[PDB]
From TrEMBL, chain B:
Keywords: Host cytoplasm, Virion. This is Capsid. One of its GO terms (cellular component) is host cell cytoplasm. It comes from the Viruses. Its main location: host cell.
Length: 293, 294
């Protein structure tokens, strides 16, 4: 089966780290990416905490508890089935923002708890300290005096906004310490390094309320991930050459190389100019690693 | 291109009316019920309808600038990317919730980067999907004043549907089509109603458990990833219906036959689909007659 990428304009696809439309792409000015969401091989093998649907991105599910003076969530997969530590660093879709304050909105999700009343709440979750242990199945919730009614209840949580940990800057490249002090989490997607030849890793961006740095970078659009999982196309070269084309004339606006590990590069800054955000990526061919952009 | 449907298990795909994994299939209690959802609407050859978007990231969201007119609060709507809603193509901005005659409980955040340097950008608000003040087709919806909106007046926000309650005096009817508003001679832009096939067939609805309180099961007529699949493929529609098998992902046994029609929905002949495992994979078998017997 021939390899391909989605025919969809970039600005109609979602970020893979937050559920937001992509509003740009850029190379970094500096920081090694080791995102756990948006990770997949070109032949469709999911990595880290990455799953298929954008509906899963940056969400959690589980049962709220109160134990030894502290509140928390016992995690499950987003469909309510159990999280098995062997399969991944955390349940699929779990936010991959580390060393920061995750401001979550949540709702009760048991149908029997959704007959009457207001099922909703909000809570802060630190992606740091030993009590942040999603690989072990648990995370601490900061007590906001409004959690008691939810103790024992199953909820789904979504990432509403993010702030820095007090005393620290907000680092969107930090890897969460999923396994606490017990172990390095199983099946972490690896860090990515650029290959040479002037190439730089491309990040797809979304404006999002990561307060103090409201531009979330990811290494693949979510719909690329589902595309590769769907296709399972064998990888047949060092790199997949893509052209980013005008959506109407199909004229090439810029070349990119996608590597088997599931990320792409460019040689930036080829006369000042700005690429539009409504272009379409098109697979041209497998090329050697020596292909010069 | 040859036609196909996603090679993804059903329970890994999203509902098209809320961003939630599909956890079931059902037929309607009244098999003559006419759905006219505005999200999850697309033809088999990839033409979007209603407020349907490509990405699940857009489902049941809104964007716009909050206003206060003499104590009447509201949002002047835009598309989710911040560009203007021109109403050329859709009855509301793309992704807009299609739950009608009910109380939408939204969570929102300021979305201008200059408003995202420090502080808490978040809030919540109730929006009624009823009354003339709910006029998203005309670019405006009323916000219920919760005494916490003033700091956001003049600010651009993105809103998402957190949960839904019934309108006082009414049941929470998930088949209701919102009254999006009319604008003189301009077309409604509504995705059309789907009339039940009859003769033993029944429309298949993909369901998700969701906090539509008092009715916590949201039905839709296509998984969201079917929509992006068809938009991507643009496969010419070569028959009046597409025969699908729903197959066990392991054993690869056919668990049931379905028909997909060009308008972008699926039917079955209940014996019903609700009893099927939810981890199966739909597979395109062949183009068949619209009269093909399941």
């Amino acid at each position: 089966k021939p390899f391909s990428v989605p025919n969809i304009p970039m600005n109609l696809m979602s970020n893979s780290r937050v559920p937001m439309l992509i509003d740009g792409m850029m190379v970094s000015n500096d920081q090694v990416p080791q995102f756990q969401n948006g990770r997949v091989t070109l032949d469709g093998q999911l990595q880290g905490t990455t799953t298929v649907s954008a509906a899963c991105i940056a969400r959690m599910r589980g049962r709220i508890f109160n134990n030894n003076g502290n509140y928390g969530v016992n995690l499950a997969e987003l469909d309510g089935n159990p999280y098995h530590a062997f399969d991944s660093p955390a349940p699929l879709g779990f936010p991959d923002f580390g060393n920061c304050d995750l401001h979550m909105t949540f709702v009760k999700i048991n149908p029997t708890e959704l007959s009457t009343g207001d099922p909703s709440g909000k809570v802060v979750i630190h992606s740091y300290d030993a009590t942040f242990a999603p690989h072990l199945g648990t995370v601490k919730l900061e007590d906001n005096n409004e959690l008691d009614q939810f103790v024992g209840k199953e909820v789904v949580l979504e990432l509403t906004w993010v702030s820095n940990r007090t005393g620290a800057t907000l680092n969107l490249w930090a890897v969460p310490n999923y396994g606490s002090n017990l172990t390095q989490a199983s099946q972490l997607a690896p860090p990515i390094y650029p290959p040479g030849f002037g190439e730089a890793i491309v990040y797809f961006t979304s404006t999002f309320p990561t307060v103090s740095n409201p531009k979330v970078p990811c290494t693949l659009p979510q719909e690329f991930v589902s595309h590769f999982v769907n296709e399972q196309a064998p990888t047949r070269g060092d790199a997949a050459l893509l052209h980013y084309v005008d959506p109407d004339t199909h004229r090439n606006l810029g070349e990119f190389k996608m590597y088997p590990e599931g990320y792409m590069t460019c040689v930036p800054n080829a006369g000042p100019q700005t690429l539009p955000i409504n272009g379409v990526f098109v697979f041209i061919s497998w090329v050697s690693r020596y292909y010069q952009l």
